[PDB]
């Protein structure tokens, strides 16, 4: 079962996800990526049902890119978030609802760093930090304990490490490696994968 995490700093957004694609009792992929580039400064972390995730996420993505092509400028992280929330909410009472939980990370030239949280019921909420999946139940409290609004990206990465290590300690699911990226004024930056040399 999948795990997402977002931590917003004063001028950046740090995001991380697990790299496991599993079915039944086996891991079928150890390098799965749960993140979707939608703008040069917007990442969409989607998680949940089998096909619903990729389908919905790619739909939103291509629509954002379509906006960019049609208008010459990209959607703001907020406009993006409300766009996805609108789409997800519209399909909620339809024949084809998408069972997806998501995070949206972004940087605006005006509003700065932003992190958004979305229920599968399409309830959108902005937060300094958030997490999805069972792992969240073990990590959120930690984030409560150590997070400060002025936290530096180094300290943020260290905090993320505390969380992931906690997952290694208490969580019954495997989850050996993690995709980690950051977003600022210079767009999306891939960081070294937090991994634990199990076997």
């Amino acid at each position: 079962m999948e795990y997402l995490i977002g931590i917003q700093g004063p001028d950046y957004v740090l995001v991380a996800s697990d790299r496991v694609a599993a079915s039944n009792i086996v891991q079928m992929k150890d390098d799965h990526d749960k993140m979707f580039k939608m703008s040069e400064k917007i990442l969409l972390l989607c998680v949940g049902e089998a096909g619903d995730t990729v389908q919905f996420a790619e739909y939103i993505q291509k629509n954002v890119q379509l906006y960019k092509m049609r208008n010459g400028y990209e959607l703001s992280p907020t406009a993006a978030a409300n766009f996805t929330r609108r789409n997800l909410a519209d399909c909620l009472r339809s024949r084809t609802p998408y069972h997806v939980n998501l995070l949206l990370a972004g940087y605006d030239e005006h509003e700065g760093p932003a992190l958004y949280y979305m229920d599968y019921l399409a309830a959108l909420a902005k937060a300094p930090f958030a997490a999805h999946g069972y792992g969240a139940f073990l990590t959120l409290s930690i984030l409560d304990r150590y997070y400060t609004p002025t936290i530096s990206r180094e300290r943020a990465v260290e905090l993320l490490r505390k969380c992931l290590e906690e997952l290694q300690k208490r969580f019954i699911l495997n989850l050996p490696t993690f995709s980690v990226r950051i977003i600022d004024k210079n767009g999306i930056h891939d960081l070294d994968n937090i991994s634990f040399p199990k076997q």
Binding site: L140, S141, D144
Partner: protein, 201 residues
């Protein structure tokens, strides 16, 4: 609920909230979830209120009779095994109950987790209740066997606090007990509203 207990060099720290709900309704915020079995034996309390209270009280009775009969104090392992055996005979009948038996033994600091499901395991740290995960987070991020006393107090109190922050069914007041070799001592009983002011600013 949101009880937790961990053993370190200077004994066994035990902590709990005090909230009691009947659905979404908060029925009480003044519940003593740490039952004083013996002056050396404590029992945390999570799940069905009546179940926990009744069965741990009966456990206390049994331990007292043991003390009178064998002219010696019951061990932690024996108390936990007693409770586990009593509870197991009702497995499947719907008793909701998850408790921790803590104390000081002839084998030193003792801590056991006992389920209504049938579990009974010794361990260093434990957290039981609806907010157990949240407590587990901070407790694990701050635990050490070489923790000084006041540090252990801070760790436990804070863990229960954060638990009450995230868990909707946990709140009221953080209660804290310390189990030492000469018996246990009632450390603290701080309301969450005050701990908020203390921890935030």
């Amino acid at each position: 609920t949101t009880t937790l207990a961990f053993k370190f060099r200077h004994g066994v720290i035990v902590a709990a909230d005090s909230r009691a709900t009947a659905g979404a309704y908060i029925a009480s915020q003044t519940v003593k979830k740490v039952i004083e079995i013996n002056p050396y034996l404590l029992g945390t309390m999570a799940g069905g209120a009546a179940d926990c209270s009744f069965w741990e009280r009966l456990l206390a009775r049994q331990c007292r009779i043991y003390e009178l009969r064998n002219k010696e104090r019951i061990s932690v392992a024996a108390a936990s095994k007693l409770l586990a055996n009593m509870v197991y005979q009702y497995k499947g009948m719907g008793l909701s109950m998850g408790t921790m038996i803590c104390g000081w033994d002839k084998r030193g600091p003792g801590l056991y987790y006992v389920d209504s499901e049938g579990n009974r395991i010794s361990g260093a740290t434990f957290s039981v209740g609806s907010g157990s995960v949240y407590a587990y987070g901070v407790m694990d991020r701050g635990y050490s066997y070489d923790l000084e006393v006041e540090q252990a107090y801070d760790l436990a109190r804070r863990a229960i606090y954060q638990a009450t922050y995230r868990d909707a069914y946990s709140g009221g007041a953080v209660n804290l007990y310390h189990v030492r070799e000469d018996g246990w001592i009632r450390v603290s009983s701080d309301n969450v509203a005050d701990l908020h002011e203390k921890y935030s600013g």
